[model samples]
Target: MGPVWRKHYITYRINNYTPDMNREDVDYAIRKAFQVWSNVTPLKFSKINTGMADILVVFARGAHGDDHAFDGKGGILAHAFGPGSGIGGDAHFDEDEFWTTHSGGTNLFLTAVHEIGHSLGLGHSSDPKAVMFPTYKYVDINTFRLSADDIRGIQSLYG
Candidate 1:
């Protein structure tokens, strides 16, 4: 699960949209999430218009296909795979939760940026400031930047 991708350029496709947000916001959020990592490493990400991409982003509810089942709303907001084939590099968000763009509810951009960190070969960081840190806390997206630990972690894999 920890293995990095063999290549630098990666492609992802949003398999479906969450009803919580409009399609445009979801699209922007995912793309921005990818950019968060690409800015720090040689890694580059592109969205696919068709066919299978290296990473598959999906929104699902409880017991939705994968081995890790979502526990409705309160727990397990989302998760992702490390680099590999098939389900590897894929991310799944729990649709049961009220995802939002603002801090009033769970922020989609923050959660996504975290999940994409997992997709890019990073695990949870002990440092609370790291994006890869376990819990989701609201931060202003306009001013948000990765912690030193997050940059080092992803660069260690892709650089």
Candidate 2:
């Protein structure tokens, strides 16, 4: 199991924005991703433009200073660390992938939702319909809902 944040209030910082999508869209996607988890638990999240936050959201390509270098385009879309200090709660999106607000390319909203789940200490779920499923698949974002498995996993840690 991954490390879980011990407090109720959490903060995140968007370290940088990706050129692939509009700044507003990126912000919306990130905010909504955090909301998905907060909606089910007592955890609260706030965005900080400056200073160190619990989670650092960044977009970078290969060899981005971490041990896990992202592969180009189709390989790995994004990844996030479990809750903790330093880079433990960071989420990195592969710059090589064409991030988008819609389904034309990689949907930032969906990817962020999954990565944020990891940041909250939830691992991949065996249930295919869960947001934490270990694969990138596009779904209707407007109708997206967390599966039963997703709720159970997060609640077990944060509820």
Candidate 3:
């Protein structure tokens, strides 16, 4: 089984922002992404500007430092570590993807939410409709909801 966070209250930080969108938009999208999982479980996420946080969200091109080097532009949009300390729960987004808040390009909110799912100990589901599925697909931001498989998997650990 994938690792799960031992605590219910967690913290996160946006170490930096992608230039594809304004800072406020990136902040809003990250906040909303955490809310997506928190809304379904007892998890409560707090954002910190400094100091250590459970999750660190960053956007970098090529190899910023991690073992996984982004392939630039169209491939390997983002990745996250599962529960632990230090790098645990951290997420890295490829700055090469044209991240956006709308339908024109890759939606920052959608991608962030998916990466957060990994950070939260939820593995990819076989269900194509699930957010935890192994690839990115555009779903209506306003209408999107977690698939039953996602709910079950997350709740199994966090409930």
Candidate 4:
């Protein structure tokens, strides 16, 4: 994945809530992740009730929505297409993940931060410390901000 090479102020609608975790937690994760990019760019995200928003956030199990399906347990907890209109900018969290804000399970905040990076057109990084790294680790999302690679990637698109 790389920068979602289109220029537009993206909008999103949370179409469905994941039954796997608290709704409040989901909202908070979204807020934190969006803030990551807002800290880097002039871009802004507005949540909507429905309709033709640029990115639509959803949760799906197995291959319910895309060519890449969940492993049903421990692989690919979530994924997002790079930036573009229509369905390209959307994100989906695998229903298989035990999402939480604490240490027992995958941190929703961390995954959302990385996924939102994807939503803004970023790909996996080789650096383990980078937010764009594909593997999910046990840690706090707020523990660090963007890597220079991340800032450079986004700014290359906008700034």
C-alpha RMSD by candidate, in order:
1.1, 0.7, 0.8, 1.9
Score residue 82 of candidate 3 by CA lDDT.
94
After superposition, which runs of candidate 3 have C-alpha atoms over 4 Å from their true positions? Answer: none
Better by TM-score, candidate 4 or 3: 3
lDDT of 4 by residue, 57-151 (tens): 88888887578877776778888888776778888888787878777767777788788888887777888878787798766554767888888
The order by descending lDDT is 2, 3, 1, 4
Name model 1 segments beyond 4 Å from true: none
* Count of residue pairs whose backbone atoms collide, per candidate: 0, 0, 0, 3
Clashing pairs in 3: none
User: What is the C-alpha local distance difference test score of each model?
Assistant: 0.91, 0.93, 0.92, 0.78
Tens digits of per-residue lDDT, candidate 1, 51-104, equal 879999999998889899999877899999988999999999999999887887
Candidate 2 per-residue lDDT over residues 18-130, each given as its tens digit: 99889999999999989988999999999998887999999999999989999998989999998889999899999999999999889999999999999999899999999
The TM-score ranking, best first, is: 2, 3, 1, 4
- The TM-score values for the models, in the order shown, are 0.97, 0.98, 0.97, 0.90
Task: Work out how many backbone clashes candidate 4 has.
Answer: 3
Output the better candidate (2/3) by lDDT.
Answer: 2
